[PDB]
Amino acid sequence: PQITLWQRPLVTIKIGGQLKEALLDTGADDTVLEEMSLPGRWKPKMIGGIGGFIKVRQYDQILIEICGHKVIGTVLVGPTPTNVIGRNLLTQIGCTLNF
Amino acid sequence: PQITLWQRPLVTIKIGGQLKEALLDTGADDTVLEEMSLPGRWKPKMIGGIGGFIKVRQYDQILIEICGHKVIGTVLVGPTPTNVIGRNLLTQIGCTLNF
Numbered sequence: 001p002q003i004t005l006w007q008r009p010l011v012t013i014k015i016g017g018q019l020k021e022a023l024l025d026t027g028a029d030d031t032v033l034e035e036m037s038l039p040g041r042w043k044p045k046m047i048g049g050i051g052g053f054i055k056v057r058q059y060d061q062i063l064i065e066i067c068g069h070k071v072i073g074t075v076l077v078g079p080t081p082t083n084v085i086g087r088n089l090l091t092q093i094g095c096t097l098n099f
Numbered sequence: 100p101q102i103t104l105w106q107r108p109l110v111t112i113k114i115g116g117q118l119k120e121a122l123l124d125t126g127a128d129d130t131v132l133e134e135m136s137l138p139g140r141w142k143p144k145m146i147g148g149i150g151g152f153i154k155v156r157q158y159d160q161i162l163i164e165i166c167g168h169k170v171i172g173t174v175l176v177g178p179t180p181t182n183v184i185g186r187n188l189l190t191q192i193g194c195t196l197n198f
């Protein structure tokens with residue numbers, strides 16, 4: 001739907017059998033979630049933002065249900081304070097900015 | 100207008116007589132620009148993101164032209180790698196996410 005930005009744009013996502021809240025972030029190229037138990041294996045990686053850099057595990061081809069829309073893509077798991085849905089998944093569900 | 104997320108959502112802003120490029124970020128509550136010469140009074144402040152926290156100066160009541168729309172609000176100036184336009188200004192220009 002159409003979501004304004006008066007409040008943080010938080011949505012419910014279903015990933016790996018679990019329900020979580022995540023922030024839709026147009027300023028993140030990638031999607032990174034707080035530490036959680038995920039299946040399969042990973043390739044380690046480092047990402048940065050405001051503040052500095054962190055280490056995350058990279059899981060590809062993972063299924064996620066965001067506001068119902070099921071999408072498959074890479075998800076990074078690590079020490080991030082909050083779960084963020086990045087552009088790699090946002091394009092998947094046809095998300096656009098408007099004004 | 101309507102902007103897809105296949106590429107970073109970069110726009111041109113005019114602030115303090117200067118032209119700069121900034122990333123439209125729905126995941127930032129605040130707007131923070133790389134070090135620049137700004138006139139006026141400020142209160143110091145600290146903000147955080149993924150790799151920890153940084154110190155920035157808080158300049159209030161600042162004018163900015165984003166994609167033509169003039170808006171007035173708080174801007175934070177500091178060691179951010181890129182300039183990001185946060186929700187405090189995005190609501191000013193009527194920006195929404197759609198899908």
Ligand SMILES: CC(C)(C)OC(=O)N[C@@H](Cc1ccccc1)[C@@H](O)CN[C@@H](Cc1ccccc1)C(=O)N[C@@H](CCC(N)=O)C(=O)N[C@@H](Cc1ccccc1)C(N)=O
Binds near residue numbers: 031080122124126
């Ligand atoms: C996630 C990934 C892929 C590593 O990308 C970024 O971190 N991108 C960030 C910087 C960047 C973008 C593009 C290229 C290079 C670098 C930017 O999108 C910021 N995204 C959010 C992600 C986020 C959100 C919530 C929590 C943790 C992380 C952010 O840090 N936003 C900050 C921006 C600074 C600001 N003050 O607005 C924010 O809103 N911080 C809040 C909330 C907060 C408090 C304390 C700690 C963390 C966050 C604040 N008031 O300080």
